[PDB]
Design a protein around this ligand. Sequence first.
Ligand SMILES: CCN(c1ccccc1)S(=O)(=O)c1ccc(NC(=O)[C@@](C)(O)C(F)(F)F)c(C)c1
Ligand SMILES: CCN(c1ccccc1)S(=O)(=O)c1ccc(NC(=O)[C@@](C)(O)C(F)(F)F)c(C)c1
Lengths: 353, 353
Amino acid sequence: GSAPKYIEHFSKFSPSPLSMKQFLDFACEKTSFTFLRQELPVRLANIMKEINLLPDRVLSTPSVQLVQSWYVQSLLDIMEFLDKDPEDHRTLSQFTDALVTIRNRHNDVVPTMAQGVLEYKDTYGDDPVSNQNIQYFLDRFYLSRISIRMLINQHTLIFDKHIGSIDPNCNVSEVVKDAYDMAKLLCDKYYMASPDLEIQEINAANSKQPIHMVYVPSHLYHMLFELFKNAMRATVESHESSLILPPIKVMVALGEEDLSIKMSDRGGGVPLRKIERLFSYMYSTAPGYGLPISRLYAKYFQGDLQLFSMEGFGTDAVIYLKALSTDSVERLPVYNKSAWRHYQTIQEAGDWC
Amino acid sequence: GSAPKYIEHFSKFSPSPLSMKQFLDFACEKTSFTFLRQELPVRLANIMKEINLLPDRVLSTPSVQLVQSWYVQSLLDIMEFLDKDPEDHRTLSQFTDALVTIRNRHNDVVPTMAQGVLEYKDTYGDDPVSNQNIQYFLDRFYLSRISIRMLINQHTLIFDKHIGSIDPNCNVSEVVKDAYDMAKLLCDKYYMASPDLEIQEINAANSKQPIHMVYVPSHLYHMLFELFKNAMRATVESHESSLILPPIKVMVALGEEDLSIKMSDRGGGVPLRKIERLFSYMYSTAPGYGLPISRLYAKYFQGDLQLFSMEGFGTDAVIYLKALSTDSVERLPVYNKSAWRHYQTIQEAGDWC
Ligand SMILES: CCN(c1ccccc1)S(=O)(=O)c1ccc(NC(=O)[C@@](C)(O)C(F)(F)F)c(C)c1
Ligand SMILES: CCN(c1ccccc1)S(=O)(=O)c1ccc(NC(=O)[C@@](C)(O)C(F)(F)F)c(C)c1
């Protein structure tokens, strides 16, 4: 009966952002164990501390409370090891199992939270301020989750060429082809027609050396797969009375600090006003969250994911990643007096008419 | 000695947004005279009322006060006519001259305000919060000015095919070629080399009917010219040891509600982190404001102007305009309790680490 106490304790610390290189220079799981014992609790606490401070209207929903209880359990699940001592080749395996169990306990957090979004929509309505607060909270909540899962996957995978989930020689174009192949398969099964792929690389400094980077391939895959699914759906549906089916074109450009991936489709495009709503959790909920969450994966390592189409023609989706492992530093949301006032939105009659 | 009184009076009214169609359905300058007598004062007052409420540090600078005094004079310049009666074919020409004089009195507002930005930079420094407030204020101030100048140009031009500054049959591609030709001329004189132009139209609903729209051609020209100047400079400089000089490609797409213009160059591109700073008034000041202000012209009629490049390859600049004159409604900034708290930025340690 001390959960509120632990949260208040660890909620005083700030999560420690790690860089893609520090992750790579990994080497004693003892070193990791002692680190994760304090970091995971700090991260769980910060996200939990922010949740506890949102409207009781949102707190009281089975959804929020359900996951809120998962975190509480996960926090307690790791406490056990605070007084434990490594050296004991079984004290640290008790941990690896403890993590693999925590990870699975949280596997359905996205759908579960999405359910609360739908509950909110029908219970209180879908207005800008509601959208804003949810957007603000879900972006942070989810990003936070991504960072926690990263640490866990790094530990579990490392202590069962690649260092955990990180590929130091990630061939971007290869991940591009993979996500395409998978989307194509689905596209063919549902529409029995699918556009082709064209890839072009632009290695600025080294004209034809294949483009490689240090990155988490499964994160990149998730982003590309989501974008390919949308570009295919739109290309196919917008040419349902055309016989020609333009291909989806991808350019992978590597500059001094940016590694950019552009995906261009001729799927008809979308009006500027609807684009703004494609990344909204609330407006994109019914009666998925591929886009808003894919973006969080981009931002997690200081990158981004942006969209811009031409209604009547097509859409460009660009994923911006940092080219250097040095610049790829975890982007973590933290609980401060700063994050507190973003929930004090009392909007009613704006500054523009 | 009543300037403060007038401002407080008219500052109680909200400016009245007009649509591109109402501007087109114009027809008695008497009707205009009586309208502008109240609207101009209301608009001058709202922008003046917001200025008076910014740090005295900014208020006391010769720049701000200098323009602040221009508005005061312009406000008083129009008061005269409040009790005047039309019918008198000379009572309303006293007005047209009164406007043509007010317009010229304000011709150098941009450079003058820019001077205050530089003053600020060296006097107090260039930090995020300073940038934010200036950005917030200058965007509104300038937009406000654009709307005032619009009314004035509409009146003066109408009462000396086109209705004032509005072309009901604006051929976009033609304005594209014009701004290109002019930028090319300058580009040739300075670099003695200039890229070519390729234009492609995508009239979704009508495959090959030339793309026309109702718009203010000189506004569109200003935006395109700025973009062409940047795309030329970058293309030329990035290929200074190449002999090939890729062309600048423009696509004009017309959809059900959007009329989009994309300008693609292969000028090397810019790192994502510097893009964010290209639209900043503060960071783009030394020791011009083409971009940030071009964007305001786009937004003025509910459109937008966005940038996205690929470091190491090139940049796409897109101008989004509303396709329907019905949707082209003046976007006006207004003074409310809402606009007040955007200047209460007390940032110090954010929500992210
Ligand atoms: C934060 C401490 N670091 C630091 C930072 C700045 C200066 C000096 C030192 S560190 O580079 O020594 C470091 C890096 C990765 C991990 N851990 C891992 O790689 C994993 C796999 O255990 C996990 F899960 F944490 F990601 C651990 C335990 C420590
Ligand atoms: C705002 C009033 N309008 C309205 C709106 C909604 C419902 C009913 C009526 S209106 O359409 O009658 C109208 C439109 C343009 C102008 N003026 C002009 O076109 C100009 C040239 O005088 C100027 F400068 F104002 F732009 C004027 C005086 C009035």
